[PDB]
Amino acid sequence: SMSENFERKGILEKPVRPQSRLEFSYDNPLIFKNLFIYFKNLKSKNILVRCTPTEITFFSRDQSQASFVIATIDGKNVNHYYASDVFWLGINRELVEKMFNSIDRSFLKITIVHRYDKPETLFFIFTDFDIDKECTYQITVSEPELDMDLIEMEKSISEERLKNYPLRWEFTSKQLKKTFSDLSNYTELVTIEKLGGDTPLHLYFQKFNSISYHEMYKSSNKINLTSTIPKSQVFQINVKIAHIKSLASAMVTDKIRILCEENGNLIFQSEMDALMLNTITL
Amino acid sequence: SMSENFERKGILEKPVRPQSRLEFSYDNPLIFKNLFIYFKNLKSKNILVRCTPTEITFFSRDQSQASFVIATIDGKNVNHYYASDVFWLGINRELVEKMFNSIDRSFLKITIVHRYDKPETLFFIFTDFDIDKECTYQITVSEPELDMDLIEMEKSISEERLKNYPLRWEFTSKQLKKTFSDLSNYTELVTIEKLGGDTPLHLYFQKFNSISYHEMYKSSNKINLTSTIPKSQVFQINVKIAHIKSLASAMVTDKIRILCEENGNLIFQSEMDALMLNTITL
Amino acid sequence: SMSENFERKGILEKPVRPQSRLEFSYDNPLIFKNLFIYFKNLKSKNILVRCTPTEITFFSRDQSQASFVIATIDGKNVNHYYASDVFWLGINRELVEKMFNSIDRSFLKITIVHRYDKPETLFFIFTDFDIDKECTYQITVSEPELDMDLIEMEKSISEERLKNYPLRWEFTSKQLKKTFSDLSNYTELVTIEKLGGDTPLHLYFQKFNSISYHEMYKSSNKINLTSTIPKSQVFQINVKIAHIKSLASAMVTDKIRILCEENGNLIFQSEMDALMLNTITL
């Protein structure tokens, strides 16, 4: 091609191929690699996929059942998107693990196709433009494990609900990785504490006669922290390290919104380019 | 010396030291490190060495006995080379493995000496010019395990023979590594297919109801592919991944010629600087 | 603060906090990480700490009992230092291993505090100025093993004594690591030899009918070698590789002075910024 140029068309009215029920093309395939590193860290067995005329969404549940993941890629932020209707697919994560891991900078495009012709097949095409090498994967997919809780959970990450979480701040992926890696050296639970008003966010654990550790954020503005906690009321929850480390180590994005409510439920929002990644830990 | 200059004299009429049956000096010692990484990957037991007044050649077979390696370093492309006559040596690869692995950029010169004086000894000298540090290895070597097949194999790689292989192309070392690492995630055999004419090179494997994978090179000119296959004839062979991955992972050179014939025999030619490396997989 | 400024006060007349028996602050926390990597490599169980109004010193003995480490950080080369008197502390290395390993470039300051109030506690504060994140460790410390040998050993490293070691030279950490890693591939003991006069330093080992190795420093000036050995007298000792590799791999400094005496005792002096590190191997 041009060597020493891909456009973003968004959703299309019709597919190039006629038998295509879904056509997807995107110029940042590393998004998918980091997305499935996350699924691997979570030890997810099956990935549920919902395709609609506007976007494609991947659903998963961590092995422990504590975490739910909702990862949506928006048709209009993507290089090429068409979907005929709303339909669902199941993918075995172990089957596609190494395929997604084989994505590197030599590929500048990822293409996903599903045809009526081949209703049990999902195509993943990776293109190396240096040598016009096309790498096509034919993946056998099931009809999904139609999970009744996916209604409640997509409900749970709505705008009306999130604004009522009284404690929220932002981390870079590196900062999230550093905090919860260090914590994992010494504990499986950390306490998150915030006095109402303009006092610092406190993260700590206490082991008697050995080691206590206290992490304190003395400038709320520098982590984009905002508190709704009534003045002189104490917010205090305990959260598990493991699943958070899984997300942070996956480095899926660059900035991550953290949302806490008083009964211990966390929500992580990491939004990068076309991907909006949501983690609900109940 | 001069710090903040080595010449290439080629083959010499006479040796510096009088008792030297072989004198070899070269300013790219990393060549030898990557060569013996390859021998390690192959699990080669013994390396056969033939010295002649013009060049030195290393011979080995892999453990699985499918592959034979011929690595020749040309006297005239080297900084300093003398050999009195044709003679042979055997080297235990396990004995010298860590030696060759200890080569790094702090060494700017490798020297190899064999004296009549010490007929069972091979000297390897590595020179660090920053601090004028000379690292001398005295390696005990044997009388070669004189392998009758080395006559057939060195013939099989003449170019009278080679220019009749009907399918040939070129990869960078990192392209070869990428193809056969990805393949090795899912299969031990890959099919190589090429229709006669100007159709694409096809690499693929098929597993029913799980995963099929197809790699296709849509521009033969970009991999320097040339086909001798009659119009509308199908060339199709199956090749083992393992030994090819061993060569590719060793990254011995920048570009590699791949040559295929119809009964499944491959030849890999990776030529870098003074070293011409040949892999025959029968 | 100021982003796109820390001063070196040295010793203070009196402490900021009134209950502080020790206040220590330093702008190169990686010094402590590499120090405790060294202690880990040595498999040190307990670290003895002596605080005085002028400096703080860490003592350790390797597991094998061969090596003694004395690491003193000078109050006057540090950003902030106060100590009320001479007192001693014991630290379990396993307890603080991961804490010291959690130091990275995101921390620009390390602070160490000991108060009369909490006498069995040692505070380590790491500050991330990008987001004003303070990470405070509360470490439980013991009263120290009263070790008789620490008197003899701090004497053994005095200037008066060191001047009589007849063989001394300097390595970069990268040179020390290279020499004793390569050596460790093939031997546990190396012979150090130096003829009196201006002959080269010799390091070698000899295994019959397999491999001998000789590394020779042909320019004493380039390793800052100075010999006190009478002309035509042979200095020859054997030294263990393991503990030297531990020091070299820890990369604690950039230059390391090596001192040898005729009965086989070595002393390593690695001095970087505030830290003066001494290794006595008897």
Numbering used by the authors:
A (entry chain B), B (entry chain C), C (entry chain A): 0 to 3, 20 to 297
Could you share sentences copied from the article?
AsfvPCNA is a hypothetic sliding clamp family protein; it is coded by the E301R gene that is highly conserved in ASFV strains. The crystal structures were determined at atomic resolution and confirmed that AsfvPCNA can assemble into a homotrimeric ring-shaped structure. Different from homologous protein structures, AsfvPCNA has a very unique amino acid sequence and conformation at the IDCL, J-loop, and P-loop regions, which are involved in partner recognition by PCNAs. Although the detailed molecular basis remains to be investigated, AsfvPCNA has a high dsDNA-binding affinity and can enhance the catalytic activity of the AsfvLIG protein, which plays critical roles in both DNA replication and DNA repair pathways of ASFV.
Using the purified AsfvPCNA protein, we performed extensive crystallization trials and solved the structures in two different forms, Form I and Form II. Unlike the Form I structure, the Form II AsfvPCNA structure belongs to P1 space group; per asymmetric unit contains six AsfvPCNA molecules, which assemble into two homotrimeric ring structures. The overall conformations of Form I and Form II AsfvPCNA trimers are virtually identical, supported by the very low root mean square deviation (RMSD, 0.2 Å) value over 840 pairs of Cα atoms. The three AsfvPCNA protomers arrange in a head-to-tail fashion, embracing all Domain I and Domain II α-helices at the inner face of the ring. The diameter of the inner ring is approximately 30 Å. We could not obtain any AsfvPCNA crystal in the absence of dsDNA, whereas Form I and Form II AsfvPCNA crystals readily grew when 10 bp dsDNA (5′-CCCATCGTAT-3′; 5′-ATACGATGGG-3′) is present in the sample. In the structures, extra electron density maps could be observed in the central channel, suggesting the existence of dsDNA. Likely, due to the dynamic binding or sliding of the DNA, the electron density is diffused, and no DNA was included in the final structures. Although it is ordered in the 7DRH structure, the four residues (298NNTI301) are all disordered in the Form I and Form II AsfvPCNA structures, suggesting that AsfvPCNA C-tail is very flexible and can undergo large conformational changes in solution.
